[PDB]
Design a protein around this ligand. Structure first.
Ligand SMILES: *[C@](=O)([N][C]C1=[C][C]=[C][C]=[C]1)C1=[C][C]=[C][C]=N1
Ligand SMILES: *[C@](=O)([N][C]C1=[C][C]=[C][C]=[C]1)C1=[C][C]=[C][C]=N1
Lengths: 309, 309
């Protein structure tokens, strides 16, 4: 047995009783619908926030949709967060991670700009990192700010790290002051004890992970697919969080360890007794509100230290 | 060239111009004086604090002197810090680290109890860890508190870890809620790039480290000498700080990385451009004030989160 919060166990039991296909039996449009419906049933609402704006920006393969959240729009220019949603590079959009983005904006008291990057299989690897890099350079070029804070969950956690590395090697007009990968993927392989322990019955399954991987068609030798295989020296101050019952946990730990070994200031949090994907499950798993708030409090402090230096 | 703050370079120019014997050419009593004089010249004063009391407590080889610092002595029962000073298990006492302990008490708003543990060579390994453990159990048995926060620099950083492991395996009457090793030693060997890079001209030298190790006479296979060689699972939330130009840096990094791999919530900070020993040099190196405040602010948060849960 592995430690599991009671409210997590209750949500897992609920999920297991539901009838309906597995995501991996569906075509991409139906998988996409399933994540939207999941958020409607099991995530909190957006809640009160002062400004939400949608717009298009130019990208290398056409327009990239973004969404700006700000709970204090008459702020002086400060750091800005660029957020990259998860969904295994196949699913997710500006609606699935809307509640979390609005919360992030409220708690951090900075603008949050979510990227609707191109998805596989219509646009396989490396469309996602190309879009994320371009949208981030665009924010630096165009949005009133002093620095960037990159963040994202799962696939988006990969995109956080990968975009951080690209901007380390070729600076944007503004520096990345901190990153916050949330239960990130950092490699393509499954040789992890956490994958063997948690790859069934904990929402993110072996089957799902195979289906995502097949659709994305990542090149395992490319830094944008496997950042754990390339030097991490000189990256920004990192807050990396894992979920203790996630198949991705061990690689998260491994990445955080690598950062430290490279001299990168690193805060590691592990959400004990909960699962992959909690940041979009805060109504179905009430304890997720605490994991969200706790992380973002810590990030706010990381950013205040950066800003007061 | 390694990044060095201007004020640190200025302090090292002073240190390198000093005449007379090097610590490692001295007997213990001469090394002990050297450190006291260093603090008088280059540390800040104790400053204003509400309560400071000395007391002798029972230990397995005789009385152990301790000193309590509290800037709010009418406090409700809350956590208490137990502090183990550094000095390579040979030098240091309650006076050498007095300014830092008073500062810690002010910033953390918790009582700090420093331990005057037995020193080598009069009392070689394992007298220090025996005393530190017994004193810590005594605080838990005798002082009004809800939990312990263990902390200490260099040798004291080893003692923090080593005492935390002992209390993990056999609980004290109160839990250890967090630890704060500062530029800790975690092994006896010198096979580290940071040792080769910084073992000359940055205060803590190959010669000083050899002299300390020879007098302490630690057993390299004992967990109390080499905690990096034993499991770290189940340790408390950890704040570990290194100094970028410290010979001990890389082992500190390695230990922080080990904690993460074991699933321990870990905050890693690296004081970039400064040296081993900075927490007692806050007048000679004015930037050390910021390293001190910055770390203690973070620790205060780690503690408020533990207490709020
Ligand atoms: C990832 O993006 N997963 C996000 C997610 C999937 C299902 C439900 C909720 C969230 C991911 C998973 C595995 C490998 C890489 N990326
Ligand atoms: C350590 O305690 N060093 C503390 C110190 C020594 C000299 C001056 C100022 C501070 C230490 C060093 C090396 C190994 C183990 N412990």
């Amino acid at each position: 047995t592995h430690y599991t919060r009671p409210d997590v166990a209750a949500f897992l039991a609920f999920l297991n009783a539901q009838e309906g296909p597995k995501m991996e039996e569906m075509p991409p449009a139906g998988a996409r619908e399933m994540m939207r419906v999941m958020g409607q049933l099991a995530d909190v609402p957006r809640g009160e926030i002062a400004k939400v704006e949608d717009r298009m920006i130019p990208g290398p393969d056409g327009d990239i949709p973004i969404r700006l959240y700000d709970n204090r729009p008459d702020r002086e220019a400060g750091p800005v967060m660029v957020f990259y949603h998860g969904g295994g590079w196949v699913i997710g959009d500006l609606e699935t991670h809307d509640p979390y983005c609005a919360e992030a904006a409220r708690i951090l008291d900075m603008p949050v700009i979510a990227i609707d990057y191109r998805l596989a299989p219509e646009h396989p690897f490396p469309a996602a990192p190309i879009d994320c890099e371009a949208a981030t350079r665009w924010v630096a070029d165009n949005i009133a700010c002093t620095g960037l804070v990159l963040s994202g969950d799962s696939a988006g956690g990969n995109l956080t790290i990968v975009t951080a590395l690209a901007l380390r090697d070729e600076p944007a007009a503004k520096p990345v002051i901190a990153i916050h990968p949330i239960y990130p993927a950092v490699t393509t392989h499954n040789d992890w004890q956490s994958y063997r322990d948690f790859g069934e019955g904990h929402l993110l399954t072996e089957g799902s992970m195979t289906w995502f991987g097949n659709h994305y068609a990542a090149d395992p030798a490319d830094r944008r697919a496997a950042p754990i295989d390339f030097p991490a020296d000189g990256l920004p101050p990192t807050l990396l969080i894992t979920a203790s019952l996630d198949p991705l946990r061990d690689q998260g730990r491994a990445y955080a360890a690598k950062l430290i070994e490279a001299g990168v200031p690193t805060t590691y949090r592990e959400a004990k007794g909960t699962i992959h994907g909690y940041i979009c499950l805060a109504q179905g798993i009430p304890s997720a509100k605490d994991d969200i708030r706790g992380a973002l409090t810590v990030l706010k402090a990381i950013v205040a230290e950066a800003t007061g230096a």
